[PDB]
Write a protein that binds this ligand. Structure first.
Ligand code: HEM
Lengths: 55, 438
């Protein structure tokens, strides 16, 4: 809180962190896609798609 | 300046066409027929090819063995081929064995036995041919290319025909086919090399005078094909070489754009890594392909029929991870026929073709094939002077206009055979038929 209850210090730090967190989130979104790229997307049948790929 | 092609007719309407060469000792005489597999329907598809086999199986006079002996004794050989629109039967011999060879050809065409026993025997030979073309990759590719481009149309049919027809072809339908199609007004007797025209005309009067005339005699090389943009993929991961053909609807023999299309084809040209000179060719595609090792070979083609054609390229490559690049760069060079070509490429290709069209005719068989082809597709032999004038009339700006209506943003027929995992789907190939920058 930066104090004894939710107040000005809390609001100002939430602003700074609210601005930041979406950038962190974008990084993790990119990371999960890079991790996915080793196997590729799964598909609704649950089988390999290595036999039949589409750009 | 080559000797003039002499042409005479008989009363039935048989054309006799000859080009003498007093420097050679052999002669190719033969019969070019304006008829082929395209004249069959779906039920008797394969008949024309079937007949080609039985033509050499014996006649009313000579048995199969006597036929063999007669040709052996002459000293030369006989040959035949059936295509979609054309059938040829010729004899290469010595100068003075020409009367024998004309007599044998007249016999096998008019007076063939087509004995049930021989039909039954060949029916197995031809069945085995169905499982051995499989090896001739270029032929496999081009037969699928016709099948898909002219989907469910007569030009789309193979020459061999389906297995089912081979088992059911009778001597009746064989006889019917050759009676309807092998008529005097559709036939040309051709002589090249050591032949006298006047002697050949007399031999035609002696042997081919009792040929039927057709009811409605149209001119030689008289024909609607509706091209289908489409693809056939014959993936085979065990093959080391990918074979790919890409074509658009091309031009007929008598198109006004016939020469324009030949010039366009020569701008792309051919390439073969096994030929020493190929790394130094002027063609842009040749340079891209050789520098980047994208292919073993490519061959541009412009195939013509009476009422349509296919214009495209045939590629072979071991570079299985760069098929995409090979196809990409090929279609980008085609794009440049629409967007970029100028007098520089066009005048170069015209120079190369002016010679190429004459070079091709280097032996009596090639000369006879040229006379026979031209007479059965155009109705006349076109002199080199006329051909030189038609080529000279092609400008850069004719090529651009032709490519813009024939290639640019057009549907393609695409056949891939072998390790073609790297060949993208139809859309991505067809998207390379235009340039977003233009
Ligand atoms: C900002 C949030 C996210 C974005 C932009 C995002 C984006 C994507 C994209 C574009 C794909 C590939 C296409 C697709 O399957 O839809 C994907 C796949 C995947 N995502 Fe997400 N994602 C997000 C959040 C999550 C979350 C919260 C989870 C799991 C709890 C998750 C797990 C996965 C998995 C497992 C796949 C692979 C699915 C498959 O193709 O079988 N993602 N994501």
């Amino acid at each position: 809180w930066g104090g004894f209850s939710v107040g000005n210090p809390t609001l100002q730090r939430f602003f700074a962190l609210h601005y930041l967190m979406p950038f962190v989130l974008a990084v993790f979104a990119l990371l999960h896609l890079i991790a996915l790229h080793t196997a590729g997307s799964s598909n609704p049948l649950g089988i390999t798609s290595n036999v039949d790929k589409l750009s | 300046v080559s000797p003039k092609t002499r042409t005479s007719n008989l009363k039935n309407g048989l054309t006799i066409a000859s080009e003498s060469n007093p420097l050679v000792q052999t002669a190719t005489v033969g019969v070019w027929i304006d008829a082929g597999s395209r004249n069959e329907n779906a039920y008797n598809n394969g008949t024309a090819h079937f007949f080609e086999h039985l033509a050499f199986k014996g006649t009313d006079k000579r048995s199969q063995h006597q036929l063999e002996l007669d040709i052996e004794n002459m000293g030369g050989h006989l040959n035949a081929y059936t295509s979609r629109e054309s059938t040829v039967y010729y004899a290469k011999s010595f100068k003075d064995d020409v009367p024998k060879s004309v007599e044998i050809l007249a016999d096998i065409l008019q007076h063939s036995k087509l004995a049930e026993s021989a039909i039954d025997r060949e029916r197995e030979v031809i069945t085995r041919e169905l499982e051995e073309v499989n090896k001739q990759y270029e032929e496999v590719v081009f037969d699928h290319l016709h099948a898909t481009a002219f989907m469910n149309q007569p030009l789309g049919r193979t020459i061999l025909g389906p297995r089912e027809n081979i088992q059911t072809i009778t001597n009746t339908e064989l006889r019917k086919f050759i009676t309807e199609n092998y008529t005097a007004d559709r036939m040309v007797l051709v002589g090249a090399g050591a032949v006298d025209h006047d002697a050949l005309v007399e031999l035609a009067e002696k042997y081919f005078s009792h040929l039927p005339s057709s009811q409605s005699p149209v001119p030689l090389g008289t024909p609607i094909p509706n091209f289908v943009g489409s693809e056939v993929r014959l993936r085979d991961d065990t093959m080391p070489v990918a074979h790919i053909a890409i074509a658009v609807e091309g031009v007929s023999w008598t198109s006004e754009d016939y020469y324009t299309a030949l010039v366009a084809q020569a701008i792309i040209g051919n390439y073969d890594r096994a030929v020493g000179t190929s790394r130094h060719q002027g063609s842009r595609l040749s340079n891209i392909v050789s520098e980047n090792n994208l292919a073993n070979s490519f061959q541009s083609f412009s195939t013509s029929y009476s009422d349509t054609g296919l214009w495209g390229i045939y590629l072979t490559s071991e570079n299985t991870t760069q098929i995409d690049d090979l196809v990409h760069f090929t279609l980008k060079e085609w794009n440049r026929l629409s967007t970029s070509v100028s007098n520089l490429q066009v005048e170069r290709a015209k120079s190369q073709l002016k010679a190429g069209l004459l070079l091709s005719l280097d032996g009596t068989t090639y000369v006879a094939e040229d006379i026979g082809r031209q007479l059965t597709t155009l109705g006349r032999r076109v002199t080199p002077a006329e051909v030189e004038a038609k080529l000279e009339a092609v400008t850069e700006h004719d090529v651009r206009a032709w490519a813009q209506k024939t290639l640019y943003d057009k549907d393609i027929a695409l056949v891939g055979l072998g390790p073609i995992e790297g060949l993208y789907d139809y859309n991505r190939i067809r998207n390379d038929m235009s340039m977003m920058r233009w």
